[PDB]
Scaffold this motif. Structure first.
Motif, PDB file in Angstrom:
ATOM      1  N   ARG A  42     -15.659  43.910   1.969  1.00  0.00           N
ATOM      2  CA  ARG A  42     -16.199  44.008   3.322  1.00  0.00           C
ATOM      3  C   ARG A  42     -17.708  43.830   3.362  1.00  0.00           C
ATOM      4  N   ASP A  43     -18.351  43.637   2.213  1.00  0.00           N
ATOM      5  CA  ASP A  43     -19.774  43.335   2.190  1.00  0.00           C
ATOM      6  C   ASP A  43     -19.994  41.834   2.249  1.00  0.00           C
TER       7      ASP A  43
ATOM      8  N   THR B 193     -25.461  31.412  12.032  1.00  0.00           N
ATOM      9  CA  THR B 193     -26.701  30.635  11.862  1.00  0.00           C
ATOM     10  C   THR B 193     -26.437  29.139  11.644  1.00  0.00           C
TER      11      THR B 193
ATOM     12  N   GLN C 220     -23.937  27.436  12.950  1.00  0.00           N
ATOM     13  CA  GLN C 220     -23.647  26.940  14.299  1.00  0.00           C
ATOM     14  C   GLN C 220     -24.920  26.694  15.116  1.00  0.00           C
ATOM     15  N   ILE C 221     -25.883  27.611  15.057  1.00  0.00           N
ATOM     16  CA  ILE C 221     -27.149  27.435  15.787  1.00  0.00           C
ATOM     17  C   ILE C 221     -27.913  26.207  15.288  1.00  0.00           C
TER      18      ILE C 221
ATOM     19  N   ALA D 207     -26.147  22.813  16.380  1.00  0.00           N
ATOM     20  CA  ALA D 207     -26.399  22.520  17.796  1.00  0.00           C
ATOM     21  C   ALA D 207     -27.820  21.986  18.034  1.00  0.00           C
ATOM     22  N   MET D 208     -28.808  22.607  17.393  1.00  0.00           N
ATOM     23  CA  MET D 208     -30.178  22.098  17.480  1.00  0.00           C
ATOM     24  C   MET D 208     -30.346  20.728  16.819  1.00  0.00           C
TER      25      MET D 208
ATOM     26  N   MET E 194     -28.043  18.358  17.095  1.00  0.00           N
ATOM     27  CA  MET E 194     -27.529  17.448  18.131  1.00  0.00           C
ATOM     28  C   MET E 194     -28.591  17.151  19.200  1.00  0.00           C
ATOM     29  N   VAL E 195     -29.204  18.203  19.744  1.00  0.00           N
ATOM     30  CA  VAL E 195     -30.193  18.027  20.818  1.00  0.00           C
ATOM     31  C   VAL E 195     -31.472  17.324  20.325  1.00  0.00           C
TER      32      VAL E 195
ATOM     33  N   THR F 209     -31.500  15.042  17.994  1.00  0.00           N
ATOM     34  CA  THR F 209     -31.128  13.627  17.883  1.00  0.00           C
ATOM     35  C   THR F 209     -31.281  12.909  19.227  1.00  0.00           C
ATOM     36  N   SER F 210     -30.844  13.562  20.301  1.00  0.00           N
ATOM     37  CA  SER F 210     -30.924  12.984  21.652  1.00  0.00           C
ATOM     38  C   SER F 210     -32.373  12.738  22.091  1.00  0.00           C
ATOM     39  N   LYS F 211     -33.244  13.717  21.867  1.00  0.00           N
ATOM     40  CA  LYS F 211     -34.670  13.549  22.192  1.00  0.00           C
ATOM     41  C   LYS F 211     -35.372  12.532  21.288  1.00  0.00           C
TER      42      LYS F 211
ATOM     43  N   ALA G  79     -18.221  52.543   0.162  1.00  0.00           N
ATOM     44  CA  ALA G  79     -18.998  51.294   0.159  1.00  0.00           C
ATOM     45  C   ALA G  79     -18.945  50.534   1.479  1.00  0.00           C
ATOM     46  N   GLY G  80     -18.631  51.201   2.589  1.00  0.00           N
ATOM     47  CA  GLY G  80     -18.391  50.511   3.845  1.00  0.00           C
ATOM     48  C   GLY G  80     -16.986  49.980   3.950  1.00  0.00           C
TER      49      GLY G  80
ATOM     50  N   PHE H 135     -33.774  35.341  14.020  1.00  0.00           N
ATOM     51  CA  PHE H 135     -34.262  34.604  12.856  1.00  0.00           C
ATOM     52  C   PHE H 135     -35.289  33.547  13.254  1.00  0.00           C
TER      53      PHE H 135
ATOM     54  N   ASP I  33     -26.013  29.340  23.327  1.00  0.00           N
ATOM     55  CA  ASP I  33     -27.063  29.363  22.291  1.00  0.00           C
ATOM     56  C   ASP I  33     -28.212  28.374  22.535  1.00  0.00           C
ATOM     57  N   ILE I  34     -27.911  27.173  23.026  1.00  0.00           N
ATOM     58  CA  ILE I  34     -28.957  26.275  23.523  1.00  0.00           C
ATOM     59  C   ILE I  34     -29.712  26.893  24.694  1.00  0.00           C
TER      60      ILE I  34
ATOM     61  N   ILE J 238     -32.123  29.595  23.136  1.00  0.00           N
ATOM     62  CA  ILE J 238     -33.213  29.334  22.202  1.00  0.00           C
ATOM     63  C   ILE J 238     -33.970  28.050  22.516  1.00  0.00           C
ATOM     64  N   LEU J 239     -33.411  27.114  23.278  1.00  0.00           N
ATOM     65  CA  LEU J 239     -34.250  26.148  23.973  1.00  0.00           C
ATOM     66  C   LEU J 239     -34.566  26.675  25.371  1.00  0.00           C
TER      67      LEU J 239
ATOM     68  N   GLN K  69     -20.859  11.343  20.375  1.00  0.00           N
ATOM     69  CA  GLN K  69     -21.093  11.691  21.793  1.00  0.00           C
ATOM     70  C   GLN K  69     -22.338  11.086  22.453  1.00  0.00           C
ATOM     71  N   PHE K  70     -23.214  10.376  21.740  1.00  0.00           N
ATOM     72  CA  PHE K  70     -24.486   9.943  22.324  1.00  0.00           C
ATOM     73  C   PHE K  70     -24.385   8.720  23.226  1.00  0.00           C
TER      74      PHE K  70
END
Lengths: 55, 254, 119, 57, 124
Positions: free
Chosen positions: A3-4, A15, A17-18, A21-22, A24-25, A27-29, B76-77, B151, C30-31, C34-35, E22-23
């Motif tokens: 579980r650790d 993280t 996933q975040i 996504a950034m 993708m955006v 690339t567009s700009k 240990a959790g 983060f 999330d976009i 953070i944007l 998708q672009f």
């Protein structure tokens, strides 16, 4: 312990996933900004050569 | 016995897991067929025989009570193990304490995310019900936003605001050892927090804002506390804001 | 049971529009976090605004809440659920504020709650 | 120093070197009128003679 | 076998390229052709629930897909093309069905385009 490692996997997956996504955006700009610059590039070529020869 | 007389009672068991282990060793020596781990199959019944005597008897029976606070030490959790899942199924709520929170300065360390009370809302005094209900919403919303977005260095303005409110919320919920705070001065600090009077003050100075404020609240504002003491009711909002604004005149920021 | 032969033609088209709207919201938060929220395209901004209303208007005022919070609650027949969501998805009611949509049983109730707020 | 960008301004401020002009949070599509204000200011500084040479990085 | 190998390469190449698709404007038509083909491929491979297809029309639709006759046809209406084709091909195209049942082989290629073109016009 078991579980650790699961919490570390879950947090890293979020993280990941975040960051995807950034990607993708950004690339567009990037593609738009390069087209925009190429739009103003003939203006720069035209102006540079007339302003020099007139100057 | 005291509950049958009609006086409220509280029982604390300092570690139920050691009781369960004494049962295991006693049963194994008796040559009884074992189960998961090696705990004998009777364990859930044995704890239910203990934990279902707790009650709140009716007015026909005397109006008593027997609240109980059992404790379980997890390894240990660990979770989804046999004793913790048994007890977590029996009890009407659970508080989960985190070691990595404790060594990060939150004390007593309590995770709002995994702790639940099925009875909650009804038990609180009406003044507390108004302020504590909104506080749950605020802290849940920032728990998720901070879990991923902390983060990265810079975020959206509205999220930087919600991150600021959550950081102040956890710092204002830190407390000392063996110094209980009476409910009257809890509602007045939580009210000061939720209504956003603490934006001007820095995160480090808050444990001093509390310290200097509770003294001020015994030097001025005794009528507020008296109305809360017996009425169980939030005082008029004009006078409460007048009190907090005067204290914010006195307190000196680092 | 979400197939046109069992439930109904309109019910199938309505439910699939609702789930596609909420799935597109789930991948856009999330976009938004953070944007800058102004960076979202005006079509995605429309999906955001309606996903906010949809997410709240799936909440409902309840008879069992009478013990916990005291409010009356009520019962909604199927036709009024499916039509009200057709009203949500059409968007003419997008001016009414998101706070009204919590704990209601009809779009007329949403008009009333805003009316108390005066909208 | 003339800096366009918050993290540049932050580094320069810690170093303390002066920043004569500044602009930040430009739209991701920058248009000529936006940066005409700073461009006209910086070239105004060179043209009026307050600078003798000028560089870009 | 002729149309299966081309279809296999088409799905293999589109499935990774869809992860980037998708672009809309990315490269010139060379990248897009793989977009256009993959999109029509995924449209043609879906099927209505519980109604099974016959083999010689199955072969003829896969040939129509994998040879590029569909490329002008707009993407939005790609499915409706199959439904109309199955009945029309029975009415007007029977010689092709007899050919496949005769030969295990693709219809005689000379009249195959013309016969498919008459359906393509009949589809609106």
């Amino acid at each position: 312990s078991l579980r650790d490692i699961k919490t570390r996997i879950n947090a890293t997956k979020k993280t990941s996933q975040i960051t995807k996504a950034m990607e993708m955006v950004s690339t567009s700009k990037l593609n738009r900004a390069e087209q925009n610059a190429k739009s103003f590039v003939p203006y720069m070529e035209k102006i540079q050569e007339v302003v020099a020869n007139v100057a | 016995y005291f509950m049958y007389k009609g006086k409220h009672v509280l029982v604390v068991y300092d570690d139920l897991s050691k009781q369960a282990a004494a049962y295991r060793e006693l049963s194994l020596l008796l040559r009884r067929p074992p189960g998961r781990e090696a705990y004998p199959g009777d364990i859930f019944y044995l704890h239910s025989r203990l934990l279902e005597r707790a009650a709140k008897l009716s007015d026909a029976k005397g109006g008593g009570s027997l609240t109980a606070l059992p404790f379980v030490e997890t390894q240990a959790g660990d979770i989804s193990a046999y004793i913790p899942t048994n007890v977590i199924s029996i009890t009407d709520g659970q508080i989960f304490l985190q070691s990595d929170l404790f060594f990060s300065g939150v004390r007593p360390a309590i995770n709002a995310g995994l702790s639940v009370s099925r009875v909650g809302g009804a038990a609180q005094i009406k003044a507390m019900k108004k302020v504590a209900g909104t506080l749950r919403l605020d802290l849940a919303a920032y728990r998720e936003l901070e879990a991923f977005a902390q983060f990265g260095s810079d975020l959206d303005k509205a999220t930087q605001a919600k991150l600021a409110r959550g950081a102040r919320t956890v710092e204002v919920l830190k407390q000392d050892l063996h110094q209980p705070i009476p409910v009257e001065k809890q509602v007045l600090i939580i009210y000061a927090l939720t209504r956003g009077f603490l934006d001007d003050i820095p995160v480090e100075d808050v444990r001093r804002f509390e310290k200097e404020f509770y003294l001020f609240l015994d030097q001025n504002g005794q009528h507020l506390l008296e109305h809360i003491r017996t009425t169980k009711d939030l005082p008029n909002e004009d006078d409460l804001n007048k009190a907090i604004e005067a204290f914010k005149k006195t307190f000196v920021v680092s | 049971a979400l197939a046109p032969e069992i439930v109904g033609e309109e019910h199938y088209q309505v439910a699939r529009k609702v789930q596609q709207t909420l799935q597109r919201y789930k991948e856009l938060q999330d976009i938004i976090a953070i944007l800058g929220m102004d960076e979202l395209s005006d079509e995605d901004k429309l999906v955001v605004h309606r996903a906010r209303r949809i997410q709240f208007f799936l909440s409902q005022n309840f008879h069992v809440a009478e013990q916990f919070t005291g409010q009356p609650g009520s019962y909604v027949p199927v036709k009024e659920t499916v039509r009200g969501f057709k009203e949500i998805l059409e968007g003419k009611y997008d001016h009414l504020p998101e706070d009204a949509f919590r704990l209601v049983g009809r779009i007329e109730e949403v008009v009333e709650k805003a009316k108390a707020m005066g909208v | 120093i003339i800096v366009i960008g918050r993290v540049g301004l932050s580094f320069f401020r810690k170093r303390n070197m002066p920043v004569i002009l500044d602009i930040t949070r430009l739209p991701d599509q920058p248009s000529f009128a936006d940066i005409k204000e700073i461009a006209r200011k910086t070239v105004g500084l060179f043209a009026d003679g307050t600078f003798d040479e000028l560089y870009m990085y």
